Design a binder for these strands. Structure first.
Ligand SMILES: [Mn+2]
Ligand SMILES: [Mn+2]
Length: 178
DNA sequence: GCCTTGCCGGGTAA
DNA sequence: GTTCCGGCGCG
DNA sequence: CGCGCCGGAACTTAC
DNA sequence: CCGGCAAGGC
């Protein structure tokens, strides 16, 4: 139940954010768990309290920074402990249980899927990661294909078959699993 | 006839 | 999305 | 001394 | 990410 919420946030983080190990001069350093998003509302009102809860549970001390940018808002937690918590979880992604599979995919979709829903698509330059989401989806009964969408930027797309749309939306985008 | 989906360019939201 | 900056906290 | 949080912001491009 | 084009399947 903390694993699930983590799985979700990790999707957002990979999708619209980053994991940053900075080195300064010196020998100063910083470690950031970052999700950036356009709706200063969404961040403050849905993403942040999820992350907050995780922070409290992992007994992390860092605060949640929300920095206004020109084009988007940025949720940022500066924390060595949290950085490694996510980075480590990333390397272990292939072993996600079902609950986490679903949560991670939902987070990834919310960050960079087709949100119009006229089509079901997930974009990403990381074929290997799409490959893993593809296998999980095949196991959930949701057919799909991967090809290179954007020849310009090396960006792949995972196309979910509208044949299986209900299954995908009802058991993933509309899941209460947390 | 109707639907699905690969393909590709614009530029918002990362 | 990624990485510069200056500044501060801490043992 | 040596690292790790904070608050921002320019610079960059993958969706 | 969007969204229009047109090929291809039933
Ligand atoms: Mn991404
Ligand atoms: Mn997004």
């Amino acid at each position: 139940n903390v694993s699930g919420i983590s799985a979700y946030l990790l999707g957002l983080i990979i999708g619209d954010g980053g994991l940053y190990k900075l080195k300064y001069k010196g020998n100063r350093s910083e470690y950031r768990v970052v999700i950036t998003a356009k709706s200063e509302n969404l961040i403050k009102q849905h993403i942040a309290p999820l992350m907050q809860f995780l922070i409290d549970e992992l007994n992390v001390k860092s605060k949640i920074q929300i920095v206004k940018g020109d084009t988007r808002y940025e949720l940022r937690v500066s924390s060595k402990k949290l950085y490694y918590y996510f980075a480590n979880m990333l390397e272990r992604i292939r072993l996600f249980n079902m609950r986490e599979q679903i949560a991670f995919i939902k987070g990834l979709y919310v960050a960079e899927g087709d949100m119009t829903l006229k089509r079901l698509r997930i974009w990403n330059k990381n074929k290997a990661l799409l490959e893993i989401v593809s296998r999980w989806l095949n196991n959930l009964g949701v057919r799909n294909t991967i090809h290179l969408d954007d020849h310009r930027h090396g960006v792949y797309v995972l196309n979910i078959s509208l044949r299986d749309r209900i299954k995908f939306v009802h058991t993933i985008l509309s899941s209460h699993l947390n």
